[model samples]
Target: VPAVGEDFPIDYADWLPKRDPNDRRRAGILLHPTSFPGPYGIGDLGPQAFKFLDWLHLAGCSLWQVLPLVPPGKRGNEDGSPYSGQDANCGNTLLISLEELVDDGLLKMEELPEPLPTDRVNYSTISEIKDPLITKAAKRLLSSEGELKDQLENFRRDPNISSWLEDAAYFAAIDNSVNTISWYDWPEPLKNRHLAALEEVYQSEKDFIDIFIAQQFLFQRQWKKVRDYARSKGISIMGDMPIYVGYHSADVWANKKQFLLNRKGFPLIVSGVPPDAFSETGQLWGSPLYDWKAMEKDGFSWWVRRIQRATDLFDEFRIDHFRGFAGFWAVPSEEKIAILGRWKVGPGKPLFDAILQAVGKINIIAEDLGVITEDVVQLRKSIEAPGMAVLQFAFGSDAENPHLPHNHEQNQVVYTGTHDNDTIRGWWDTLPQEEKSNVLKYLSNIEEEEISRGLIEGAVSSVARIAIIPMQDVLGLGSDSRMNIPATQFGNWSWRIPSSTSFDNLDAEAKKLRDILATYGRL
Candidate 1:
């Protein structure tokens, strides 16, 4: 925890609580790269991202948090979910900048498809338009002279890179083919990963698989550029790492034994939360539960590899559903809802201990929210990782509520609102009369229009070591700009800001935010 970067990638739990009060605090902006505005529909690690990082630096933000870098759900089932991606190991090829391909001489700007909307992501058409172009770029890269091919070989050869990439590429290629055969539906030989059958598929569909491999390469290369840019600016990139992988994910396909899966490759028990005040039936998240015993027997090699990959990209990461590491709710796969689920033991502190023994010190933020229990809290405290606090959740509850600013601890990372919450403006606009009065009272009766900034200033002034404000809140967007609405199926994960106003208004906003941050000693 001590021998790392001056500010980050190390647990501030033991440090911040005892540190000098005069020491400046840390602040960040939470905006997934996909929400970054660019000409080619969705955001990418292109010039737009660099410009946004510059904006963050100008605003006195030393941190930039993003969602998962992996590809969203598979073809025919696209949900644009960063947490439940098609593959755990590979990057989303959609985020591969076609402009970068043109710069590399593998493509032409004219080859780019018509731009999608900058204000919202059309996830449906994005892959259709971008994939073929990326495929073309991959094909061109393969046809290139020694250097390009050798670079790919080098990437594949990296010690830190896993065979998970190859598995993901194969799964993605087959997923994209016509007729839409699920890997589990393949004839027994291929379904069971018979080497001969797999070799035959590779021989027959070399072109398709090769394109996916090249695309992964492109994603890694482009992202490394952005990460390096962030490093040069002394800005830390905080990423999100979800607890579970989907049943149909490449991780499950590659290592079936690591999950509680049936012979036909379906989950034996799925993940979810038991019924609570939020619902009668509860939230039935269908990702397969981990076989913790098996993982531990293997020295948690899967998790070790995963953490290493994450460490390669981010300075720090929030482990989503951190309570699951202490214990999780397990619903029988046959159950229709999570109400019948039961508690199951999770990996707990041993997992973290293993990861540290293997990878050394890492800065992990435990997403110790939701129905957290004493055991979960103990694990987080034992790990010395910071937990989270959202300002939006503070005022509606009593003073003892942990989310309340007065109850916040130094070993915490405060947020104005998270991606799952509506922007501060949106939440304020819809708050009932009494709740509004309570919130105003908490902030010295600030005006309605000033609520967003008031919460921003409050978070910055908190004793928490880190404060992260979502970009939507900074732009004062409304409910339409909400990143995700839990349990909803459609019309989610599509929010983005327009490029026209994104930059035009950013300069002045940057100065305004910088002044507030400076006043609060976060600058």
Candidate 2:
């Protein structure tokens, strides 16, 4: 491998081109996989995903932004949040398309359950209905003495596939057997990963291990088709990468030395944000904090591998919580509140240098929101990564906010509102009259009914090189269609695009957006 900060072996720019500097622009939509309308209770890499891509292409979008494809939540409530997945490298089995499995002869159509509502994701129902079926299909594939069996073997034998698969299979086997409890609650020998205990479990649960690996193979296979279809339609998929790993994730459990974990495998110092403008108590994430010194000692090998994997999965990857690259909030694991956390310096430029050396000229967008400091700004600029600007933050104050359209730089990626914020219409309905007027006046007194269009116009017309609006905004949805509300649980991540929300009547919406793009020379 090339030394950290040195040129990489491959010319990444050749494979992943940058935006043209001469007045051209790009536009995208922020929509999660689960929100894609489908028959399977939640969206999968099925026909709907391809149809969604078609819609984006029809709407003159060149980018399709998706949240992390990782499994949501390690256990229990955590399963609902993609950011809290059990394994960073493992594909979510929940996203595996059953229809495709049936086509492959791994499942039977008659065995499938009735389709769920298309308006919202019912994760629990899907889990209960599909989990057993997926397991059964895995068993069928394993038992069938035919091409499917050979395919499974070939997938497992591939060097790249087995490296993460070994650990993922082991983790899944133990976690499933124990009723999906945290790893720390497992038997001491298994919890601590004693060699003999692991060997014994592997020998006894070969079927379960193979099933987990098979599920990953299926997810990757299905997603590749969707990705290829999107690319064929002249759209590049943008993927999100969360900064912190879940405490119970395979990355942490398998490599405890890289984290600030106690002897019994609990986080010593957790990840969080101190009191910021967003909240008084701050945000207590409770994920394990990295042992940066140890990571640096190894030249940030873990992060390099993570980024390299991301490069394979996305045309461009957005780093969630880019502020953490410069400095992070270190909260005591024992504390239940985030206000008591302290800011600690991160690995900064050195880490990114290592990643670049590993992955070559990869495209990166930084999620530089929330209490940004001069150091964070400097770090982002120094790395030449495009920072984010949310239009919702613009009208909050009379002072010049960097998020405002006129203040935006060409290197930024602008959005009307992210998955975390309320829908544009919802935000307008709740805003006090003064701020509302400020927004209306700023957009040349456009009526409240046209607020979403006005914000979309501001985003695409900004100096920002790429403009992305959430599908909620494109469809003019209210709070009921909100994807998430930070720091809250349950009611989030369930909103789905209705089947009726098709492009049949969106000709005007598409034309307006396309016209705005043309006016800005973004088309």
Candidate 3:
């Protein structure tokens, strides 16, 4: 494969091999982990997840995709978002199931506590409710007398640990000792990771370190069950991998020298895309940009490991900011607005080569949305990764728009709209009459009320091999069901499908989707 930033010169299939020729078409849904319905305050890798698997199977869907599974950043919680999470490499302990922990003998099932409010995710209570139990489970699991102890020992030696396990464990241990304070607020020596201080923590707080690692052990073990169950039902998982890391993340703190930072070890510049439909000032994401030159020297080990971990968790992965490989917008640390940012070249191919070498034959997709450049297109094509086309982007263009079913490429994945945009109904309600007219003309014979359903049918019926719709769209939800509104951060990513939403004896929905797939030679 060509280097990261370089144009991909070959067909997309060059990077996507080992195909199941019999499986021609695919369909999936987008629901973040937090949206998984359960008795707990938040969704988790518990019975609810398994129930969701059954729901998808019943619906005749074959894929379950989610946002990046990471711990949300403390400072970046300006609007309770995961895109600007605290640690890209660590799992959200918030998603760990307390019930499952009890069943696994880590916690007493009878001792399982009641849940927080169901209306919204209380990130505040994550530490108050979940963290203590995770600690309890981790501590007891580490000191247990059973097969789990052996599993932990074996897991410690796994090559993946070298990527971030020990350092993450150390970070977690430090947080536990200090009332879960942000890493940036730690003492100078601990913040800088002075050798003596770290050694002291290891010697003095060894049990705490082991406890942290034990939590991950349980998380991975439970996650595997969910993934395996999804696969058994012929449902592949589409995983998201963010392009940047938080300023105070385990990745940055553990590998401090690998980022562009100032004397105090804070980022000198951060990551965020330029202005578009989402925001006029652009999204001012506060993540620190990687020191590309440092990454190159190490053959992009961090980048490769990040993807490898992602693949391990999901069958296929989507590069969240595919254009970042070609070039990314960098806003100075002191900048108040993203308008002050400028585009700079990313590590490109050298980084990708490292990933390709680590995880052979990755089933990946490029989130090649937004103002795509030739370089970005070439980079995606060079790897033979499929790009994204949103039906929502079809308006304000010719009838032959790529997002139009007639012009879609078979290898691509299409959606009516993504988590970042409004629900189809909400969009239709807000769109101008001219665009609505164009929409009706684009999909002849479909009425206005049927626009959302029409878009869904067009997507699955398109030449594109893979089509995914938000669960909100599948349920015909409105703007109120929108997942995440970009610039205005609050009151987003909180929409949940009512647990009581009835599907009835609706086995035919999935069958019809499969029928559509069959018609397009996609199934």
Candidate number with the higher TM-score (2 or 3): 2
In model 2, how large is the Cα lDDT of residue 348?
93
The whole-model lDDT of each prediction reads 0.84, 0.83, 0.78
lDDT of 3 at 306: 79
Task: Give the alpha carbon lDDT tens digit for every residue of 296-392 in model 2.
Answer: 9999988887886787678997989989989999998889999887899999999988887777877789999867899999999998999999999
- What is candidate 3's local distance difference test score? 0.78
Question: Model 3, 233: alpha-carbon shift in Å?
Answer: 1.7
List candidate 1 stretches off by more than 4 Å. Answer: 1-24, 74-78, 177-181
Question: lDDT by residue for model 1 over 269-381, one digit each (tens)?
Answer: 99988877874678888888899999999889899989998898898899899999998999999999888879999999899999999999888999987778999999999
lDDT of 2 at 378: 96
* 202-281: candidate 3 lDDT, tens digit per residue: 99889877777787788888888899999899888988877777665678888877888888887899887678765467
Query: Which candidate's lDDT is highest?
Result: 1
Native RMSD of candidate 3 (Å): 6.4
Candidate number that wins on lDDT, 2 or 3: 2
TM-score of each: 0.93, 0.92, 0.89
